[PDB]
Design a protein around this ligand. Structure first.
Ligand SMILES: Nc1nc2c(ncn2[C@@H]2O[C@H](COP(=O)(O)OP(=O)(O)O)[C@@H](O)[C@H]2O)c(=O)[nH]1
Length: 303
């Protein structure tokens, strides 16, 4: 099999990883990296790494990406042990901050150099979070694009239609914790439990590609495979049409009622909606706790 590890860098990344653990995510190994020691105490993650004990004194990075970066460099040795043995690494974070913006490109570089498959699933701050935060976000993404094989970036501003009414500012990122889960889980489930899936294909589809898009669709009808896939390619999470992708990774997740016929019939929707020369690979994941629900996750990389 393959050894998959999910690393959360920063408070936001660590909070998303907490949600992943809480949601019942499995097949994967969680790691929590923060400069803030006291917030790292709140991590459900099995392995915890506090970085920049000297630089920060466990106080935090003060939303300074320069501090977060040196913190990771200072503890580069400790990061390497965590990543050791990993076939795939996920770097989960939120950009615009200090620990996430600065240190996550370091963890991503350390992982990719060690021969792991590095995908980073990160977010972009809300428009209201600041002007500095958006500024350090963009620079953080660019430092992430270079450091990783494939990068999925989800602007929080697109999650603004699905945010729960009367929610406070402190709970504003609950949907970010979900969408970060959907991206990490959509891939993790497909490798570890997927049916038509072999790792070298993922490696090919996702290595040194750069930017990617994520679409999730859910349906429970007679033609749920078609419906969920059509929802997936028409998802509000993709910035643009999937047609520009020269690779597509598709996860069809369903219960025991999910057939070979259903899987391909769903995959036909995703392949018309993309260029005719795409390398598309899909697989089936079985969660027996699903009776009539089916979830389709597509990752469109290549542009
Ligand atoms: N997914 C998620 N993102 C968050 C959360 N809190 C903050 N963020 C995002 O992460 C950025 C702040 O980074 P944060 O982890 O809080 O501080 P850092 O340690 O300096 O990286 C903000 O721009 C937010 O958009 C959270 O609970 N979950």
């Amino acid at each position: 099999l393959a050894t998959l590890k999910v690393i959360g860098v920063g408070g936001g990344g660590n909070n998303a990883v907490n949600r992943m653990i809480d949601h019942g995510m499995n097949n994967v190994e969680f790691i929590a990296i923060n400069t803030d020691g006291q917030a790292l105490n709140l991590s459900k993650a099995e392995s915890k790494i506090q970085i920049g004990e000297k630089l920060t004194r466990g106080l935090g990075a003060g939303a300074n990406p320069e501090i977060g970066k040196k913190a990771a460099e200072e503890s580069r040795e400790q990061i390497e042990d965590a990543i050791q043995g990993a076939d795939m690494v996920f770097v989960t974070s939120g950009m615009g901050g200090g620990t996430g913006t600065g240190a996550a490109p370091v963890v991503a570089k350390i992982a990719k150099e060690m021969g792991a498959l590095t995908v980073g699933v990160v977010t972009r701050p809300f428009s209201f979070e600041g002007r500095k935060r958006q500024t350090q976000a963009a620079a953080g993404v660019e430092a992430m694009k270079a450091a990783v094989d494939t990068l999925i970036v989800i602007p929080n501003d697109r999650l603004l239609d699905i945010v729960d009414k009367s929610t406070p500012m402190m709970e504003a990122f609950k949907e970010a914790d979900n969408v970060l889960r959907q991206g990490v889980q959509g891939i993790s489930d497909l490798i570890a439990v997927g049916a038509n899936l072999d790792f070298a294909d993922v490696k090919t589809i996702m290595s040194n590609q750069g930017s990617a898009l994520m679409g999730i669709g859910v349906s429970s009808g007679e033609n749920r495979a078609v419906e969920a896939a059509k929802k997936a390619i028409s998802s509000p999470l993709l910035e643009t049409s999937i047609v520009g992708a020269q690779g597509v990774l598709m996860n069809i997740t369903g219960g025991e009622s999910l057939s070979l016929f259903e899987a391909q019939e769903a995959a036909d929707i995703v392949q018309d909606a993309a260029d005719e020369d795409v390398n598309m690979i899909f697989g089936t994941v079985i969660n027996p706790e699903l009776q009539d629900e089916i979830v389709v996750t597509v990752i469109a990389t290549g542009f």
